Amino acid sequence: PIETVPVKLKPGMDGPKVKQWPLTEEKIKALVEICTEMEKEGKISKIGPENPYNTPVFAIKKKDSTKWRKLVDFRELNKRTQDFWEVQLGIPHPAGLKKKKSVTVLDVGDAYFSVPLDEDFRKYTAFTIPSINNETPGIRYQYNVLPQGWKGSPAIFQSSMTKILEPFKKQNPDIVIYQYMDDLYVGSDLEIGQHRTKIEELRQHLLRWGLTTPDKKHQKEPPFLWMGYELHPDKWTVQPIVLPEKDSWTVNDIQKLVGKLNWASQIYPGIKVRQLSKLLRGTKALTEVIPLTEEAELELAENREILKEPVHGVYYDPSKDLIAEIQKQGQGQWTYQIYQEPFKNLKTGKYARMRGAHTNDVKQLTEAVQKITTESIVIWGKTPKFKLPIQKETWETWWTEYWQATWIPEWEFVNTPPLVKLWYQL
Amino acid sequence: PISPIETVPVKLKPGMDGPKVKQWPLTEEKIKALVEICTEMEKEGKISKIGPENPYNTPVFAIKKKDSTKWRKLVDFRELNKRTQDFWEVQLGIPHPAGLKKKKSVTVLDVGDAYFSVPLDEDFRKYTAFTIPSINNETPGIRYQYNVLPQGWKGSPAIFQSSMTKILEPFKKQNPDIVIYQYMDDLYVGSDLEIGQHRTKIEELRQHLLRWGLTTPDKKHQKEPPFLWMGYELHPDKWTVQPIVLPEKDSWTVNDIQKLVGKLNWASQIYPGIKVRQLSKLLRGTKALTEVIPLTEEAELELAENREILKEPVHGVYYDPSKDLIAEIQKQGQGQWTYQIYQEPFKNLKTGKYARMRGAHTNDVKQLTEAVQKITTESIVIWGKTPKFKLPIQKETWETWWTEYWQATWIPEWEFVNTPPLVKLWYQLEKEPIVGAETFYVDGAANRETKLGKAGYVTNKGRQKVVPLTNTTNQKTELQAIYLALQDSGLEVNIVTDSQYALGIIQAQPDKSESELVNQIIEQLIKKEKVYLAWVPAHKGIGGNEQVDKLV
Ligand SMILES: Cc1cc(C)cc(Oc2c(CSCc3ccco3)c(C)[nH]c(=O)c2I)c1
Ligand SMILES: OC[C@H]1O[C@@](CO)(O[C@H]2O[C@H](CO)[C@@H](O)[C@H](O)[C@H]2O)[C@@H](O)[C@@H]1O
Ligand SMILES: OC[C@H]1O[C@@](CO)(O[C@H]2O[C@H](CO)[C@@H](O)[C@H](O)[C@H]2O)[C@@H](O)[C@@H]1O
Ligand SMILES: [Mn+2]
């Protein structure tokens, strides 16, 4: 018996017909291998010309076992198969998760491969391994089982997940377990050693009683976040707006300051530039040094005060989507703001790695995006839409060179205005 | 033509039904031509007389072939095509010559009756019914239905292709050596075997195709190198574009032009230096295919250069996977770049151009980086890898421009080619205010209805100035006030504006613009020794700024 769950597309919607991006011979050879095996294993099947649908496929590395892995871009299919499964009242995203000392992320995507996919729905999961220089028509396939990356996979497996995790949760009542797509987020306030030990009990539990398989990302090699994918949200900073501390102020310094403070006024109501502007009265050389008045600091220092405590009257609305803007700050540094309505930041932040050996803007941006998305998932339960400060073509050419996640957010390309100044640091 | 290949299942779109288009009777001879054609087809299995039951109908017609003893049946499935399900779209792209690899011998095989050789899904036949009218308004007329892929149906191209692929699958596996390209009803077979052994395999392939209902050419090939293929001419060791011919006209129409550019862009693949900026600039204004267009001085000066280049023939070479890919780019003139990709000195795989500004204002570095991107994408498509770049820019130049640039860019490994004109930054703005430099507070304003304006400045040294402007905009006066300050200052100047717009343009350090005013500002910036540009919130009591705001 093949107990497949009936699935359908959103009303009045047709399957996705997205074009395959041209791929390097290297990535093509990898895909051919991976698919030849999945086929032999019954996970996918070759299809004929009567199937007109298509979803983009990519080849990435989960950071180097020198293994390759297929990454299907089901962003389009997800939007037509599901913002309606039972997408709003099962187990939504838990709130204590972002307060835990440790949250470990484990990939349970391999479970799905056991469950057969609904017959009438398969057609919609078709993809194409491209050919070089159009020499031959691409190799076409469709799925016979729940695919990793499709948003219906976790939903259909849900019942089975909650069933396997039951015993484990029944004995560890102080461990929050939140699932998002192909991943499980396990958080606790234990000590690193206990926390890690406890994750290991979970792995082995899935393995033996799931006969499900979570990969063993053994612990750290380089100094920071390596075992499963070990986060520590209770230690997540906020990058507040900072106003320079001054020795000697020049007309030009105060002008810049007044501009930044003025801009800030659209967020912090208490900010005032009255006693600060008075020092500019007259048309002076930008160099001219000027002593801060007595009422100045009584205003300036008062501003630094307001600009410390993130604003309020900002609540997360689940019907609206999150938007993340990132700005290149130079020196391997990057700032970002997650929001839903302009000038209502739910969060602000920074990301930086400049002088290991190997890094470039695209790689940096690529990691920043995955970092923001993960924090985003942990804090709100969804991935945001990114406004990337890079050129469409460039991003499309290289993002898969450093992508490691199993999910892919929405993104658009923008041209940052000189407000990087109003967000930069030190 | 009797293929035993399993059929591909077909369906009409959801809810729709077969087509019921009435046949409007015709000529005495035309009906007779059909009956004779269809009787011969019936004998061959291609079609079958259907019962009085119910097949729908599609209009039939018959034409004089471009030879007069034989006529041609012709079905207009337009209606069936509309009710038929979508299929996986057949290869819209085409293999590019510079991507093919060197082959000792290449044979071209034409499949005959391609479509009529592949069976049609049994259940779908009924919708292909048609009827040849009667003696003349008397007898009912004969009803026929297709049993094979009809010459004008929607699913024929894709189903044929897929069937061909399946038929070739076993052969290509018993000959990992032979390479076969499928394109429509043609098959290009190549190999690095001895002419006698090659001719051997070809005959094999042929017999294989034949045992699957596919007939190939008799002299084993009506293949005579060089092959004229899709606007290309392929020789055993080189390739070129087919004879390019530019028409000389007195009155050019929108249509005349578009056709010119199109041909020019096609020459661009292998003829270095082709340009089409001006001829194109002069094009899409509006879309009259027939609205005569007056040839611009530049457009004719450009067309002239193109003619000269096309005078001497050029050729491209084939790909050698062993050797690697190299791309070289050289600046031309005014947002125009040309490039060539090669493996060996003096042997081009292909060439190309990049003339896209991506904005009102830009600079060489940013355009150079984009050209690199277009080439990279093309290289991946044609060869499956990225080439090593040789660019007219030194590491310092590019290094500087991006550490400062607010956007994220990237370039595969590259090498500096010292062969002017070299790409460079013509001016850099100070990152801090100058000390013994007069500070200019500038402002511009315009009437949104009268479109009259003002531009001026007030400096710390006590100088003031205002200049009247006509038919202008708020944003335009803002740039003009800056231009004004630059004109009245020394080799070093501090400028303060309240215009984010003018800030954004200049802070982007452009060396060329579609704006006349911006190019003048740029000329001034180059003259200057040190320029520091600053911004302040308008109408906020900033001394300097308030005084000048009231002035203008
Ligand atoms: C009409 C045509 C189109 C294409 C896309 C390839 C082809 O034959 C080829 C050719 C070129 S065809 C001309 C030729 C090759 C040798 C002698 O004459 C090359 C270089 N390499 C190959 O692998 C094959 I197959 C023939
Ligand atoms: O990368 C941009 C490019 O990707 C496509 C698919 O080829 O669309 C994807 O990315 C969009 C922006 O994030 C999504 O809206 C869409 O869901 C996803 O398929 C192109 O449409 C787009 O130009
Ligand atoms: O290594 C390439 C080197 O050779 C030159 C001539 O000295 O270029 C030749 O070959 C190119 C393509 O193979 C042609 O586009 C070029 O016109 C031809 O002179 C140098 O230009 C180049 O540095
Ligand atoms: Mn102004």
Angle between helices A152-171 and A192-210 (to 10 degrees): 120
CA separation, residue A262 to residues A259, A269, A273, A283, B508 (Å): 5, 10, 7, 20, 24
Q: Which chain A residues have a beta carbon less than 8 Å from that of B547?
A: 283
Q: With contact defined as beta carbons under 8 Å apart, do B4 and B212 qualify?
A: yes
Mutation target for B interface from A9, A140, A255: give the one with most B CBs within 10 A: A255
For ligand 3, mutation pick of B238, B323, B346, B390 (most atoms within 8 Å of CB)? B346
Residue with the smallest CA separation from ligand 2 atom 11 is A410
Ligand 1 atom closest to residue B104's alpha carbon, by position in its atom list: 16
Question: In angstroms, rounded to a whole number, what is the distance separating the alpha carbons of residues B368 and B331?
Answer: 8
Phi, psi of B350 (to 5 degrees): -170, 175
Domain boundary among B399, B426, B453: B426
B106 plus B170 within the same structural domain = yes
- Chain B residues with CB-CB distance to A289 below 8 A: none
- Is residue B22 within 8 Å of B133, Cβ to Cβ? no
Whether chain A has a CB inside 8 Å of the CB on B370: the answer is: yes
The answer to whether the bond into B421 is cis (omega within 30° of 0) is yes
Backbone angles phi, psi at A142, to 5 degrees: -140, 155
> Phi and psi (nearest 5°) for A253?
-70, -45
Q: 3-class SS at A182?
A: coil
Q: Contact, A397 vs A214, CB < 8 A?
A: no
Ligand 1 is surrounded, with C-beta below 6 A, by: B 95, 100-101, 103, 106, 108, 179, 181, 188, 190, 225, 227, 229, 234-236, 318
Asked if B378 and B489 sit in the same domain, the reply is no
Per the listing, tokens 């700032």 go with A335
- Please, which experimental method was used? X-ray
Nearest to B407 among A282, A284, A390 (CB): A390
Distance CA A256, CA B381 (A): 48
SS3 B164: helix
- Structural contact between residues B137 and B23, judged by C-beta atoms closer than 8 angstroms: no
Dihedral, CA atoms, A162, A93, A375, A267, nearest 10 degrees?
Answer: 180
| Inter-CA distances, A404 with A236, B374, B404, Å | 22, 26, 28
Break-preceding residues in chain B (C–N over 2.5 Å): none
Q: Which atom of ligand 3 is nearest to the CA of B272?
A: 15
Q: Quick one: which of B338, B359, B357, B358 has its CA closest to B348?
A: B338
**How does strand B347-354 pair with strand B337-344?**
antiparallel
Is the alpha carbon torsion for B414, B419, B421, B425 positive or negative?
positive
Query: What is the DSSP code (8-state) at residue B449?
Result: T
List the single best residue of B103, B542, B549 to mutate versus A (max A Cβ within 10 A). Answer: B542
What count of other Cβ atoms lies within 10 Å of the Cβ of residue B222? 11
d(CA A4, CA A15): 19
Whether residue B137 sits in one domain with residue B75? yes
Q: Name the superfamily (CATH) of residues A96-120+162-230.
A: Reverse transcriptase/Diguanylate cyclase domain (3.30.70.270)
Helix (H, G, I), strand (E, B) or coil at B180: strand
CA distance B52 to A275: 98
C-alpha distance from residue A217 to each of A227, A293, A402 (Å): 5, 59, 18
Boundary (domain end) residue, out of B304, B319, B334: B319
Beta strands in A232-332 (DSSP E): 323-330
The residue out of B197, B225, B253 marking a domain boundary is B225
Angle at A231 between CA A229 and CA A236, to 5 degrees: 155
Among candidates A277, A287, A288, A283, which has minimal Cα distance to B440?
A: A283
Q: Nearest Cα to B178, choosing from B162, B207, B199?
A: B199
Task: For B337-384, give the DSSP string.
Answer: EEEEEEEETTEEEEEEEE---SSSEE-HHHHHHHHHHHHHHHHHHHHS
The C-alpha angle B353, B359, B365, rounded to 5 degrees, equals: 60
What distance in angstroms lies between residue B391's CA and the mean position of ligand 3's atoms? Answer: 13
Secondary structure E strands in B239-362: 239-241, 252-253, 292-293, 326-331, 337-344, 347-354, 361-362
Burial letters B304-343, b for 16+ CB under 10 A, else e = eebeebbeeebebbbbeeeeebbbbbbbbeebbbbbbbbb
Window 367-406 of A: residues touching B by CB (8 A cutoff) are 388-391, 393-394, 397-398
Q: Does B512 lie at the interface with A, CB-CB under 8 angstroms?
A: no
Helices (H), B10-126: 28-43, 78-83
Peptide bond into B226 cis (omega under 30): yes
Q: How far is B87 from chain A (nearest CA, A)?
A: 5
What are the backbone angles phi and psi of residue B113, rounded to the nearest 5°? 60, 40
Exposed / middle / buried, residue B186 (Cβ in 10 Å: 0-12, 13-18, 19+): middle
Residue B98, phi then psi, degrees to nearest 5: -65, 0
Structure tokens at B114: 């391609």
B158 touching chain A per CB within 8 A? yes
Grouping H, G, I as helix, E, B as strand and the rest as coil, residue A68 is coil
Minimal C-alpha gap between A322 and chain B (Å): 22
Residues 6+ apart with CB under 8 A from B182: A136, A137, B161, B164, B165, B168
Burial of B118 from C-beta contacts in 10 A (0-12 / 13-18 / 19+): buried
Q: B98: helix, coil or strand?
A: helix
CA distance B339 to B343: 14
Is residue B199 located within the same domain as residue B279?
no
Q: Does B325 lie in the same domain as B440?
A: no
Contacts of A54 (CB under 8 A, 6+ apart): A16, A17, A18, A19, A20, A126, A127, A128, B88
The secondary structure of A256-282 as a DSSP string is HHHHHHHHHTTT-TT---HHHHGGG-S
Nearest CB partner across the interface for B504, out of A134, A280, A418: A418
Residue A248 C-alpha to ligand 2 middle, in angstroms? Answer: 50
Length of chain B (residues): 552
Q: Which of A141, A147, A157, A71 is nearest to A113 (CA)?
A: A147
User: What is chain A's length?
Assistant: 426
| β-pair partners for A188 | A102
Residues paired with B131 in a beta bridge: B143
d(CA A388, CA A391): 8
Do the beta carbons of residue B348 and residue B332 sit within 8 Å?
no
Single-letter residue type at B497: T
Angstrom resolution of this structure: 2.4
| Token couple for A279 | 């020092």
Q: Do B220 and B330 lie in a common domain?
A: no
In this structure, what token pair is assigned to residue A323?
């938007």
Distance CA B17, CA B340 (A): 54
Q: How many CB atoms lie within 10 A of CB B534?
A: 19
Rounded-to-integer distance, Cα A342 and Cα A266, Å:
10
One CATH from 3.90.1280.20, 3.40.50.280, 3.30.70.270, 3.40.462.20 for A317-422: 3.30.70.270
How far, in Å, CA of A378 to CA of A233, rounded?
A: 8
Tell me phi and psi for residue B139, to 5 degrees: -85, 145
Dist. CA A72–CA A150, nearest whole Å: 8
**Interatomic CA distance for residues B255 and A310, integer angstroms:** 61
SS3 category, B255: helix
Q: Cβ distance B470 to B452 under 8 Å?
A: yes
Query: Could you tell me which residues come within 8 angstroms of residue B466 by beta carbon, excluding any fewer than 6 positions away?
Result: B454, B455, B456, B551, B552
- Burial A27-47, CB ≥16 within 10 A → b, else e: bbebbeebbeebeeeebbeeb
Instruction: Please say whether the beta carbons of B62 and B33 come within 8 A.
Output: yes
Report the distance separating Cα A30 and Cα A43, nearest Å: 17
Q: How far apart are CA B163 and CA B171, in angstroms?
A: 14
Q: What is the spatial distance between Cα B451 and Cα B454, in angstroms, rounded to a whole number?
A: 10
Tokens of B375: 């080439």
Is the domain of B83 the same as that of B180? no
Long-range contacts of A366-371 (CB under 8 A, 24+ apart): A366/A398, A366/A399, A366/A401, A366/A402, A366/A403, A367/A402, A368/A326, A368/A334, A368/A336, A369/A324, A369/A326, A369/A409, A369/A411, A370/A403, A370/A404, A370/A405
CB B406 within 8 Å of CB A389: yes
Q: Which run of H or E residues covers position B257?
A: helix B254-267
B328/B419 Cα distance (integer angstroms): 11
User: Which contiguous run of DSSP H or E holds residue A81?
Assistant: helix A75-81
Residue carrying structure tokens 């994220």: B408
Task: Please report which helix (H) or strand (E) contains residue B534, including its range.
Answer: strand B530-535
- Which residue's CA is minimally distant from atom 2 of ligand 1? B188
Asked if the domains A6-95+121-161 and A231-316 are classified in one and the same CATH topology, the answer is no
B379: nearest Cα among A22, A138, A390, A403: A22
Tokens read off for A349: 């932040």
Instruction: Please choose from A411, A412, A414 the residue to mutate so as to test ligand 2's pocket, defined by most ligand atoms within 8 A of CB.
Output: A411
**Which ligand is closest to the CA of B319, given by its number?**
1
Residues B23, B60 contacting (CB under 8 angstroms)? yes
Domain at B282, CATH number: 3.30.70.270
CA pair distance B467, B445, nearest whole angstrom: 11
d(CA B13, CA B466): 71
Same domain, B526 and B545: yes
Q: Are strands A183-188 and B60-64 parallel, antiparallel or unpaired?
A: unpaired
CB B335 within 8 A of CB B362: yes
> Distance between the two ends of chain A, CA-based, in angstroms?
64
d(CA B29, CA B283): 49
DSSP bridge partners of B110? B186
The total number of structural domains in chain B stands at 5
CATH number at residue B81: 3.10.10.10
How many CA atoms are closer than 13 Å to the CA of B17, on its beta-carbon side? Answer: 6
Do residues B405 and B511 share a domain?
no
Protein residues whose CB sits closer than 6 Å to any atom of ligand 2: A 18, 56, 75-76, 79, 396, 410-411
Residues 6+ apart with CB under 8 A from B89: A52, B158
Q: How far apart are the first and last CA of chain B?
A: 85
SS3 assignment, position B117:
helix
Domain ranges of chain A: 6-95+121-161, 96-120+162-230, 231-316, 317-422
Q: Which of B161, B203, B151 is nearest to B182 (CA)?
A: B161
- DSSP labels, B395-427: HHHHHHHHHH-SSB----SEEE---SSPP--S-
Residue B458 shares a structural domain with residue B544 = yes
Distances (CA, A) of A18 to A73, A147, B89: 10, 17, 11
CA-to-CA distance for B341 and B381, rounded, in angstroms?
A: 14
Element (H, E) at A71: strand A69-72
In three-state secondary structure terms, A28 is helix
Beta-carbon separation of A135 and B181 below 8 A: yes
Q: Are B399 and B527 part of one and the same domain? A: no
B18 & B151 share domain = yes
In whole angstroms, what is the distance from residue A371 CA to residue A125 CA? 28
Domain that holds residue B264: 226-319
Which among A242, A347, A251, A254 has a CA at the least distance from the CA of A304? A242
DSSP state of A390: B
Residue A374 DSSP SS3: helix
What CATH homologous superfamily does A231-316 map to? Reverse transcriptase/Diguanylate cyclase domain (3.30.70.270)
Based on the number of CB atoms within 10 Å of its own CB, is A170 exposed (0-12), middle (13-18) or buried (19 or more)?
A: exposed
Looking at residue B505, which CATH number applies to its domain?
A: 3.30.420.10
Buried b (16+ CB within 10 A) or exposed e, A50-76: bbbbbbbbbbbbbeeeeebbbbbbbbb
d(CA B454, CA B551): 9
Q: What is the DSSP letter of A52?
A: -
Q: Which ranges in B44-190 belong to alpha helices (H)?
A: 78-83, 156-173
Is B186 labelled a binding residue? yes
Looking at chain A, the residues that come just before a C–N gap of over 2.5 A are none
Element at A231 (helix H, strand E): strand A230-231
The residue whose two tokens read 């060791």 is B237
3-state secondary structure of A370: helix
In CATH terms, the superfamily for domain A6-95+121-161 is HIV Type 1 Reverse Transcriptase, subunit A, domain 1 (3.10.10.10)
